[model samples]
Target: KIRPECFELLRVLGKGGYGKVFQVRKVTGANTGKIFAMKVLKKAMIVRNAKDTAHTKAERNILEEVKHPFIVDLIYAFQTGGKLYLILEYLSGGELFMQLEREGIFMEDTACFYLAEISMALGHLHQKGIIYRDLKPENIMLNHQGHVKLTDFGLCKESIHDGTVTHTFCGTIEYMAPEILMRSGHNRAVDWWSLGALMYDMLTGAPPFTGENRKKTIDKILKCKLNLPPYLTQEARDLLKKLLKRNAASRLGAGPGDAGEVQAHPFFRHINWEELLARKVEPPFKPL
Candidate 1:
């Protein structure tokens, strides 16, 4: 067993619904200077034990399979007496949410770049039989060099093509798909919807749904309106309408179509899929 003090715990990075995270340094021989983000889960809370087990399992599986440029890599996992520890990739630039909040809306090209990268990442995960149920700005972190890295795979699920979706009303309300909010059982397609919502927010500076109360937000989500202003570009409006499909089956790059068919969509027409995965195409804009 590795001793807790073997690594120097530097300071708390952030805290949220799950637990606290700390920046740490390993005190070892060859790697005496190594550092990592250790995500610690305290077992004292009921939510941690009951509601968060799925997250724990997903995380374990994600560490086992996922390895891509856009997804954060999970290096190690272990458990202590009353807690669990996840050694994850350290991203010094912080959450994309913070960047968006400070920078307001993004330009069309920038939104397209994030969309392409996230799509490629999700497509890779889906191919591995993993369904990432939650996709939001808050969960996506920017690396020190200002690149995307998807973190927090807690809401993910393992699915064969025919598996029924879990009816858990999870994820941020505004970003949730119509089918998810309807409680009609949903799957990885939800993430595609979220991509559309994110794109709309990128151009509009705010999500389609907004209100003072949870119920009001739910009502707006169910409506799933694009409501783009006349000045908005046609390409932005078109992609949003297609992605926010009510049935959730015909959205951009979601159906069981060949990659060629998906690549031909007007929304993705400009992107070179081969170059994107290779990191040859740099994102158009960043807060920096």
Candidate 2:
């Protein structure tokens, strides 16, 4: 729990349709000098937009309960008249999308490094019976050390026990899985499909399928073939193909081991699972 007077707002870091994010410093507590990012959402807007009130509450709950090396941490959650505030770890390096835009695309090892971290995080969420419905570069942040920290849980589904399926028309169109597009009941496998889309974007600077509009992109995803370039390595192509399988059951990480299948892929031959989980593996990029 926290109060609005507990921290001093330094500046607005970013703004979204819901609210503004501010970089604040705890000025009057034992935690003084500690910087944090506070997300302030207006209650009136949430009501006017017809946002799912339960979903927003779930996001706050998940952030409060889950803690992992690759996932952003929630330090405090409090509310005031007409607004709700969530205090999160201040990630100075900003969104991974910014970095990807600057470089156009990443080298193989670099992409592998980020993917490895994200895989572990997803595995953790699955183990907790939560399905991360959204997985995109914009939701992934980079810290000062350039390590990936996944943020955002508003679209996630909780208590997704094994063998159970959920039907939700959610997630970004460019990264949405085939099953998700078909409105067929989906499971954690949807996230794996998004991972493949993310990998394609990282290697080629664009998703495997796209169109002039959202409807066309969804159509392409449902009917078009995955186009891979000749420049990609055989291992990369194989992993991408396995991950992008149209059948949810056929996806690489859709197995009982969850993300283990992905970790065992030949493209990640050099990865040390234990070391990566401990964040001991040296990141390929150091944000400036």
Candidate 3:
């Protein structure tokens, strides 16, 4: 258990369906006064779902295992009086969602670049047998340097290499893949599907499937409509259809054997994988 003096809780940064996230400065410690986003999960809220708590633990494990410039870094974590304190990297530029909101729509090249960054990120995580179940613009952050850094891995999971799919129907409705919505077992391949969905949203300024009722929207996603706007390029539509395939097994880049195949897709053929992976290629746009 930790005392309040151990860290000076700063101000509330944001709140969501989970709990409150605070901007904090550690006090009376080696990193005193250093800024960090402390994600505090109230025990009462966590204990309500034993299954979800297990998932959270798995996410913590995954975050602890990985390190890269494009992903958020976990500074520290501790359990105090049934509450969980997760100290994460302090990013000053805010979330990608906010950028999208301000711009309404983004340039196609910028959107493609975002997809490239996210694809490389998911590729790295999937290589480690991890699946980021929840992926959306809101969970992505742009650091002070304007680089895309993936965060909020709460819905991600790390399990034995069974190649079996996870059946957790969680995450924002529009971003949820068909297999997950259908409660079908899905593996890391699901992240690729999410990447495709994100690209679609980027191209059109809104999710491909949206409705006033969340359930109805999700229902549309499960249909695997491949509802590309007439203006979309054929290559773009083709990619979406493949990724959003209802049959997880037949999906474009479903796990392991086919997961890395996304790097070879026509839409991404021009991407210099070697350069992007090495961070040699800088993103085209930076958040101001």
Worst 10 residues of 3 by lDDT: 155-164
In terms of lDDT, which candidate is stronger, 1 or 2? 2
Candidate order by TM-score, decreasing, is 2, 1, 3
Q: Is candidate 1 or candidate 3 better by lDDT?
A: 3
lDDT tens digits, residues 186-225, model 3? 7876787787778888878898788788778887887767
Q: Arrange candidates by lDDT, highest first: which order?
A: 2, 3, 1
- Segments in model 3 whose C-alpha atoms lie over 4 Å from true places: 1-6, 16-19, 28-33, 155-171, 278-280
lDDT of 2 by residue, 24-133 (tens): 99988688989999888877756544345666787898888898989999999998879989999999877888878987888999999999899999998888888886
Pairs that collide, model 3: 165-186
User: For candidate 3, what is the TM-score?
Assistant: 0.83
Clashing residue pairs, candidate 2?
none
Off by over 4 Å in 1: 1-3, 16-18, 44-51, 155-171, 258-263, 285-288
**What total of clashing residue pairs does each candidate reach?**
0, 0, 1
My TM-score estimates for the predictions, one after another, are: 0.85, 0.90, 0.83
Every candidate's lDDT: 0.72, 0.84, 0.74
Query: Predicted candidate 3: what Cα RMSD to the true structure?
Result: 5.5
